[PDB]
């Protein structure tokens, strides 16, 4: 699309997950978004994902953005892997 | 700061300028926001840019968002005069 990249970091600006949707959407989701910006030659790294999924991530889901700051060098996929443990014990 | 990088971002997606604020500040503030994030290996580009700009761009400043698409190719310098334009005549 014409308006690819820049829907795209409004969307990742403004996610928001709380436990509804299955992770399963939420994580292929923001995996899709990261990879188009970043095939359009918008390279969101693996901290500042993190940081934009942290925020927003709310519900019993809140606290994830506490402990990053113990979590240096987290990859996407290591939150999305706390984010799947904490939906199936739901 | 540890944090720059998605707070620069956030900053670009919840642009709302309406003539309140001097174009001076609203312009150097978006400038260095797509200069750092472009320093820091986020490279937003002048149609990209121009478009987030753009949205968000509500009041009497609205108009520019419908204009865009006969500007193709149109660099944040140049959105900017517009706005700058307008800002005078106020």
Same mark, same amino acid.
């Given at each position: ?7 795209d !970091?409004?969307?990742?600006?403004n ?7 299955? +992770?399963?959407?939420?994580?292929? $989701?923001?995996?899709? !978004? !990261?990879? #188009?910006?970043?095939?359009?030659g918008? %390279?969101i790294?693996? $901290?500042?994902?993190?940081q934009?999924?942290? #925020?927003?991530?709310s ?5 994830? #953005?506490?402990?990053?700051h #113990? %979590? ?5 996929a290591e939150?999305?892997?706390?984010? %799947? +443990? !904490?939906?199936?014990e739901?």
């Amino acid at each position: 699309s014409d308006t690819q990249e820049a829907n795209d !970091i409004v969307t990742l600006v403004n996610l928001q997950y709380n436990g509804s949707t299955p +992770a399963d959407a939420f994580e292929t $989701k923001v995996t899709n !978004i !990261i990879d #188009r910006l970043n095939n359009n030659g918008i %390279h969101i790294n693996n $901290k500042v994902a993190c940081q934009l999924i942290m #925020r927003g991530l709310s519900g019993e889901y809140k606290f994830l #953005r506490y402990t990053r700051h #113990r %979590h240096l060098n987290m990859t996407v996929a290591e939150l999305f892997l706390d984010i %799947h +443990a !904490i939906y199936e014990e739901q």
